[PDB]
RNA sequence: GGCUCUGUGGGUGCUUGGCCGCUGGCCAGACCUACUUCAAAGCCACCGGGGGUACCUACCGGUUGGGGAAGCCCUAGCGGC
RNA sequence: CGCAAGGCUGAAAAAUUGACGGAAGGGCACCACCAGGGGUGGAGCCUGCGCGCGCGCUACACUGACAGAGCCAGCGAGUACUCCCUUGGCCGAGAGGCCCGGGUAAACUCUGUCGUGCUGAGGAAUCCCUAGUAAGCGCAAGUCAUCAGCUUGCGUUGAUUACGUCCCUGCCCUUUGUACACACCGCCCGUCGCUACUACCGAUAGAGGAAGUAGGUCUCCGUAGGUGAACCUGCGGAG
């Protein structure tokens, strides 16, 4: 029985895949290969709420929309969708009588 | 498991022994498992009914391979025989008894004649051609066999190594190398070494599959993949 | 495969015997740990054992872990407790009747992951063989008298215990009309057990609550709408199967959806359904003097 | 042992060490570290060797006959024939040690039981 | 005529000589014992686990009595720091 | 032994996390569709459940009756097992024992003899069933609960038709999470609560009512000082 799986993280850079290749006089890839930057566009930049602007929000689509230009109906619907995700996870006698 | 999801889809079951060879069909419809319960299974997973048709064999299944045009499958057992089954109507259509065609042996530390050594008489791995007309078969032995899947004959046999520094490359060892203390390629000669890191034996007693000690003097000949 | 089942059952029985001897020693070692922390003087037969102190220095930590409950006891259920969904098949006797087959369907529908199998001509060792060959967690056999069921046999696999029980007061699902009943919801049921206090009661509680798939523990206290109740009086465990809506924060409307039993267990054997020669753990002692006075579970 | 008794890495490596030794069949229990004090033993390794474990499984009669039979090469462990009489058989390969394919010892057992199938 | 046992030779890896104090000799051998300037660079080097340490040994730091390579200086000496 | 052990009393909330839905898209199901099969329900018997209801059992003819021939199982061994009760007689002083009367399969295969003859296979509904499964058949046991009005095993013979689809009836789940590459998708919708703030209404600064928003290195030279030959620092010049 091998071992219990314990979490291990590996730090990859933004270098091309011919930096992960082994040492040899020339690459095995062509000229098109060798520009693939070993981290996807989702790791180069992903639009999210932690990297958004102050006035704006980002949607689920990855599009900045501002709270000022958003209408009341869309504000209510966005509040409902976030709430749906959260759900998924002795006095006086005159004062008495009168 | 699923690749795009990451979590475990299922544990299929119905085998009475450890499952030795798996093969998905090249069109994508049928898994075939082969296991040491002397059995194989045509698993149909992707349909709405998940079903398992057994193929009962004569000994432990060692290898499973598909034809590229997926109507045929060859499964190689522990007797040394290849059986060519059909996958649509699960009937054996062909068969080769291939013990003699692959039996080439007599390692050092082997007190049997090379004809009587069992263990180097089976096909551990088999692959169809990209044409689909010729199997290629290799086991724990010196010979690679290339069978025809229609005419059922051995088209060509190959020898992997002439190298006598490996252990099982000739079936008749000569009696010049047999002293009165066993064979001459068996006496521990580590003590006649000038360097300490060559003299030290950090080996574990009884470790067939690898140890970092790894004496590895006269390793066996085996074709582990084709 | 069969050699592995036999070898693992023999290893389990040997480990249980070693646990008996080690418990006889570890009742003495827990006095030495409590006297070390609190300073009360202990017995000389405990304090003058050099082997006990020399081995106590290594075996502190499992006693501390058992005190904190960080480890679980060596059991046939603790290997796969909340990891695998326990699959379970329900079968009849050999030539069932129509009401026994409809009752088999009803108590299949009681478990959300169960399957039902037609017996027909199926020899009982091959039934056990096919269960171990398809890695079933539980089998449940049914016995009828004349269209009314009289016995269950709940057997845990690969080598686990049988609980054989006799059924009384069975009111079937198949007696009420389809206008009043309906298709039973198959959600993962809550379970409640009421009145089990002896270690034998916790044994039968374990072999009854490991028949059901494990509930997702994120919001299980409020979600889920289906409950199954095992409550015993006079060691005859009575079971109901309800479905509920929470009509307010203070009130709840129940609706009886499944069959009613009062099963009484009469045999708990440490060994599967095929082993008639397995060592029993408990059996209903009739024809003794005070076997009717004494209440187990 | 020398770690403090309420330590997390002590408890985790106790369970790992006991599970590893019980899976290799050296210890007979996995609930005491005094087993690794005075029960792990070169005799326990040497009785987890192959001719003694097939003496216990009654594949042979005695360890001398078992060493002779696995030097002549009748015994496979799993799917591979074993010629080394020092191959340490673990607890889950004791369910897979059996005779080889064309074994005369297997023909002798089948001829005794009168099930000698010549096919 | 047959079985068994034993012995010798060849083969069981691709064919370039027997020996020596080997660029030359010898297989019948021959000659016998010379010649010499300056001991050495360091490191590593596998004994099963826990424990004891009186004695021996290893390592480190010292103590008495002798010993003086080398470094420094100059009243030049059998010198001095 | 001390405390518990003194009745503004007289039966039938939480929430920035909550309450209920809808639409779209999936997955599954002989409690669904589809194709077939089989019960029950008609007559009689009876356990059981509350005269009624089903569950078993039996009878109901082409798949016939009679006579032959041949050929097949598996589970089953506690000095232990027996179906009654009686008319007579024996030996019985008496209790009894005797004798004689009365109430290892089925199936299957083959060969002949006769020929539909109170000698009639179950309505509406409702339920179940997908491979050694439905259905037929016998043999054995009787295991501390249940079971002789039966129960549970065990062998034998062994099909038709589905093995697709969510269209109907439903059940479960997505619309949050749980992993990253390719690749794809692209802010699901409603009625209210709760909280914060803002102003309003009117009785006595105030509890309510109603509403809205969220860039000079190296070397040399001339200097001036430093601890003086030299040498160091600072500056001014040339290479």
Q: Which helix (H) or strand (E) holds C165?
A: strand C162-166
Asked whether strand F has any atom less than 7 Å from the CB of C236, the reply is no
How far are the Cα atoms of C10, C81, C209, C268 from residue C273, in angstroms, in the given order? 17, 21, 19, 11
**Two tokens at C262?**
């009062």
The answer to whether B125 and B108 are in contact (CB under 8 A) is: no
CB B85 within 8 A of CB B39: no
C-alpha separations of C144 from A41, C72, C125, D2 in Å: 67, 39, 21, 62
CA–CA distance, A26 with A6 (Å, rounded to integer): 38
How far B116 CA lies from chain D's nearest CA (Å)?
A: 9
Q: Which two tokens stand for residue D111?
A: 């001829």
> Cα–Cα distance between B40 and B84 in angstroms, integer?
12
The tally of CA atoms less than 13 A away on the side-chain side of residue A98 is 4
Cβ atoms of D5 and C64 within 8 Å: the answer is yes
Structure tokens at C294: 């004494």
> CB of D81 within 8 A of CB of B119?
yes
Residue C54's Cβ-side half-sphere holds a number of Cα atoms within 13 Å equal to: 8
* Runs of H (alpha helix) within C111-239: 124-133, 199-209
- Chain D residues contacting A via beta carbons under 8 Å: 16, 19-20, 23
Helix locations, chain A, DSSP H: 41-44, 72-88, 93-97
Q: Return the closest-CA partner of residue D50 out of D21, D71, D22.
A: D71
Of residues B184, B194, B185, the one with CA closest to residue B166: B185
Beta carbons of D11 and C11 less than 8 Å apart:
no
| B194 secondary structure, DSSP code | S
Distance from CA of A7 to the nearest CA of D (A): 15
Residue pointed to by tokens 């079951």: B13
- C-to-D residue pairs, Cβ atoms closer than 8 angstroms: 50
DSSP classification of residue B164: T
Question: How distant is C1' of F113 from CA of C138, in Å?
Answer: 61
- CA–CA dist B154, C102 (Å, integer): 60
Q: Are B82 and B65 in contact (CB under 8 A)?
A: no
Q: Which two tokens stand for residue D41?
A: 């033993």
CB atoms within 10 A of CB C292: 11
List C-alpha distances in Å: C10 to A4, C5, C15, C212: 26, 9, 9, 27
- Structure token pair of residue B37: 């319960």
Nucleotide nearest to B50 (CA to C1'): F163
Q: At what angle do helices C2-38 and C61-68 cross, to 10 degrees?
A: 90
Tell me whether residues B110 and D82 touch, CB distance under 8 A: no
d(CA D96, CA C41): 54
- The CA-atom distances, in angstroms, between B226 and each of B31, B131, B162, B222, C127 are 21, 16, 19, 11, 42
Please name every residue paired with B138 in a beta bridge, in sequence order, or none if there are none.
B125, B144
Chains B and C form CB pairs within 8 A to the count of 13
The secondary element (H helix, E strand) that includes residue C138 is strand C138-144
What is the rounded CA–CA span in Å between residue C242 and residue C258? Answer: 7
Residue C176 Cβ < 7 Å to strand F: no
Q: Provide the 3-class DSSP secondary structure of residue B83.
A: strand
Structure-determination approach: cryo-EM
CB C15 to CB D30 under 8 A? yes
As for chain D, the residues directly before each break of C–N over 2.5 Å are: none
Q: Is the peptide bond before A40 cis (omega within 30 degrees of 0)?
A: no
Distance, in Å, from the CA atom of D107 to the CA atom of D98, rounded to the nearest integer, reads 13
DSSP chain D: --S-TT-HHHHHHHHHHHHHHHHHTS-S-SS-SHHHHHT--HHHHHHSSHHHHHHHTTSSSSHHHHHHHHHHT-EEETTEE---TT----TTTTTTEEE-TT-HHHHHHHHHHT-----
CB-facing half-sphere around the CA of D105: CA atoms within 13 A: 18
The SS3 call for residue A82 is: helix
Rounded-to-integer distance, Cα C34 and Cα C64, Å: 11
Apex D8 CA angle, D5 and D13, nearest 5: 90
All residues of chain D having their beta carbon less than 8 Å from the beta carbon of residue B110 are 73, 83
Q: How far apart are CA B17 and CA C125, in angstroms?
A: 19
Let me know: does C241 contact C256? Beta carbons within 8 Å. yes
Q: In D, which residues are within 8 Å of A3 by CB distance?
A: 16
Q: What's the number of CA atoms in the CB half-sphere (13 Å) around residue C216?
A: 8
Residue D29 contacts C where some CB pair is shorter than 8 Å:
yes
Task: Copy the structure tokens of residue B107.
Answer: 């390692």
Burial of B147 (0-12, 13-18, 19+ CB in 10 A): buried
- CA-CA distance, B121 to D80, in Å (whole number)? 11
Q: How many helices (H) and strands (E) does chain C have?
A: 7, 11
* D95–chain B Cβ distance below 8 A for any pair: no
Q: H/E element holding C151?
A: strand C149-156
Choose among C235, C87, C268, C265: nearest CA to C162: C268
Q: How far is it, in rounded angstroms, from Cα C156 to Cα C163?
A: 9
Angle formed at CA C211 by CA C206 and CA C214, multiple of 5 degrees: 90
Q: Is D12 on the interface with C (CB under 8 A)?
A: no
Q: How far does Cα B60 stand from its chain's mean position? A: 12
Listed residue (C184, C205, C185, C183) closest to C194, CA to CA = C205
- Those residues whose beta carbons lie under 7 A from strand E are B 164, 170, 172-176, 196, 199-201
Contacts of C209 (CB under 8 A, 6+ apart): C191, C193
Q: How far apart are CA B123 and CA B145, in angstroms?
A: 9
Picking from B47, B48, B69, B54, the residue whose alpha carbon sits closest to that of residue B17 is B54
Burial zone of D4 (CB within 10 Å; 0-12 exposed, 13-18 middle, 19+ buried): exposed
SS3 (DSSP) at C27: helix
Question: How far, rounded to the nearest angstrom, does the alpha carbon of residue B26 sit from its chain's CA centroid?
Answer: 22
Strand F footprint nucleotides (protein C-beta < 7 Å): 13-14, 17-20, 27-29, 31-32, 38-40, 47-48, 54-56, 126-137, 144-147, 149-158, 163-165, 169-173, 175-183, 186-193, 203-204, 213-214
The strand ranges marked E within B110-224 are: 125-128, 134-138, 143-148, 154-159, 178-179, 182-183
d(CA C94, CA D52): 46
Distance separating alpha carbons of residues B152 and B81, to the nearest angstrom:
12
Query: What is the CB neighbour count within 10 angstroms for residue C98?
Result: 9
Q: Which residues pair with B179 in a beta bridge?
A: B182
Q: How many other C-beta atoms can be found within 10 angstroms of the C-beta atom of residue A35? A: 10
* CA to C1' distance (Å), from A76 to F209: 26
Contacts of C123 (CB under 8 A, 6+ apart): none
Residue B5, token pair as written in the block: 């999801």
Please tell me chain B's helix, strand, coil percentages from 3-state DSSP, rounded to the nearest 5: 5, 30, 65
What is residue C171's DSSP assignment? B
CA torsion sign for D70, D71, D72, D73 is: positive
Q: For residue C294, is it left (φ>0), alpha (ψ between -120 and 50) or beta?
A: beta
**Cβ atoms C189, C228 nearer than 8 A:** yes
- For residue C272 the two structure tokens come to 């599967």
| B136 in Cβ contact with B129 (< 8 Å) | yes
B50-72 in b/e burial notation, b at 16+ Cβ within 10 A?
eebeebebeebbbbbbbbeebeb
Q: How far apart are CA B154 and CA D60, in angstroms?
A: 40
Query: D78: nearest CA in chain B?
Result: B36
Q: Which two tokens mark B219?
A: 């390793």
Strand segments (E) across chain B: 19-24, 31-35, 39-44, 51-56, 61-66, 72-77, 81-86, 92-97, 125-128, 134-138, 143-148, 154-159, 178-179, 182-183
DSSP string, C208-268: HHTSSPPPPTTSTTT---EEEEEEEETTEEEEEEEEEE--SSS--EEEE-S-BEEEEEEEE
Question: Could you give the C-alpha distances from A62 to A40, C123, D65, in angstroms and in order?
Answer: 16, 63, 75
Which two three-digit tokens encode residue B200? 């030290």
B27 to B22, B40, B46, B71, D102: CA distances (angstroms): 15, 19, 12, 10, 38
């Amino acid at each position: 029985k091998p071992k219990p799986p314990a979490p291990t993280l590996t730090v990859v850079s933004d270098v091309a895949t011919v930096a992960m290749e082994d040492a040899q006089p020339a690459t095995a890839q062509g000229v098109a290969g060798g520009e693939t930057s070993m981290i996807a566009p989702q790791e180069v930049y992903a639009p999210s709420k932690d990297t958004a602007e102050k006035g704006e929000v980002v949607t689920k689509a990855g599009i900045p929309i501002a709270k000022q230009e958003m209408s009341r109906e869309e504000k209510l619907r966005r509040r409902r969708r976030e709430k749906e995700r959260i759900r998924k996870a002795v006095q006086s006698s005159g004062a008495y009588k009168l | 498991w699923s690749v795009q999801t990451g979590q475990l889809l299922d544990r299929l079951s119905g085998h009475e022994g450890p499952v030795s060879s798996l093969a998905f069909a090249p069109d994508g419809s049928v898994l075939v498992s082969g296991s040491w319960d002397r059995t194989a299974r045509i698993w149909s997973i992707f349909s709405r009914t998940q079903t398992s048709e057994p193929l009962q064999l004569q000994s432990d299944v060692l290898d499973v391979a598909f034809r590229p045009d997926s109507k045929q499958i060859a499964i190689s057992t522990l007797d040394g025989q290849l059986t060519f089954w059909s996958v649509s109507e699960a009937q054996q259509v062909s068969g080769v008894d291939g013990r003699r065609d692959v039996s080439g042996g007599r390692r050092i530390t082997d007190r049997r004649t090379a004809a009587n050594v069992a263990g180097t008489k089976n096909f551990n791995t088999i692959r169809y051609s990209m044409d689909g007309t010729c199997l290629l078969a290799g086991g724990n032995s010196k010979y690679i066999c290339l069978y025809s899947t229609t005419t059922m004959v051995l088209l060509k046999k190959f020898t992997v190594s002439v190298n006598l520094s490996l252990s099982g490359t000739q079936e008749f060892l000569n009696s010049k190398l047999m002293t009165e203390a066993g064979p001459v390629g068996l006496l521990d000669d580590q003590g006649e070494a000038s360097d300490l890191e060559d003299r030290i034996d950090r080996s574990l007693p009884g470790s067939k599959r690898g140890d970092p000690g790894a004496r590895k003097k006269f390793p066996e000949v085996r074709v582990s993949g084709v | 495969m069969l050699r592995k089942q036999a070898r693992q059952r023999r290893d389990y029985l040997y480990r249980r015997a070693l646990l008996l001897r080690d418990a006889e020693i570890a009742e003495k070692r827990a006095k030495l740990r409590a006297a070390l922390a609190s300073g009360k003087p202990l017995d000389p037969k405990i304090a003058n054992d050099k082997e006990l102190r020399k081995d106590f220095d290594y075996d502190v930590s499992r006693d501390i872990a058992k005190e904190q409950g960080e480890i679980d006891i060596d059991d046939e259920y603790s290997e796969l407790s909340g990891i695998v969904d326990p699959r379970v098949l329900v079968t009849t006797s050999r030539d069932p009747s129509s009401r026994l087959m409809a009752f088999s369907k009803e108590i299949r529908l009681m478990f959300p992951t169960a399957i039902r199998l037609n017996r027909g001509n199926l020899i009982l060792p091959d039934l056990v063989m096919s269960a171990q060959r398809e890695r079933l967690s539980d089998i449940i056999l049914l016995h009828e008298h004349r269209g009314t069921p009289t016995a269950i046999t709940i057997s845990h696999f690969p080598h686990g215990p049988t609980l054989m029980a006799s059924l009384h007061n069975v009111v079937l699902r198949a007696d009420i009309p389809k206008s009043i009943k309906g298709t039973v919801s198959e959600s993962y049921p809550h379970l409640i057990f009421e009145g089990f206090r002896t270690p034998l009661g916790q044994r039968v509680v374990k072999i009854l609550k490991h028949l059901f798939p494990p509930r997702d523990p994120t919001n299980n206290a409020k979600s889920g709408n289906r409950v199954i109740t095992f409550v015993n009086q006079d060691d005859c465990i009575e079971v109901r199967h309800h479905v509920y809506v929470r009509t307010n924060y203070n009130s709840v409307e129940l609706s009886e959806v499944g069959p009613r039993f009062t099963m009484r267990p009469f045999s708990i054997t440490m060994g599967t359904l095929e082993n008639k020669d397995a060592d029993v753990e408990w059996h209903l002692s009739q024809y003794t003097r005070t076997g009717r006075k004494k209440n187990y579970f | 042992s020398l770690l403090p008794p309420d330590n997390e890495v002590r408890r985790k490596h106790e369970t790992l060490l006991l599970d590893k030794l019980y899976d290799m069949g050296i210890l007979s229990t996995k609930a005491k570290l005094s087993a690794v004090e005075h029960n792990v033993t070169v005799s326990a390794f040497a009785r987890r060797r192959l001719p003694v474990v097939m003496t216990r499984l009654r594949m042979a009669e005695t360890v001398q006959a078992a060493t002779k039979l696995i030097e002549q090469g009748h015994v496979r462990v799993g799917v591979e024939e074993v010629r080394d009489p020092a191959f340490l058989v673990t607890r889950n390969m004791e369910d897979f040690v059996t005779w080889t394919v064309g074994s005369k010892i297997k023909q002798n057992i089948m001829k005794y039981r009168d099930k000698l199938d010549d096919f």
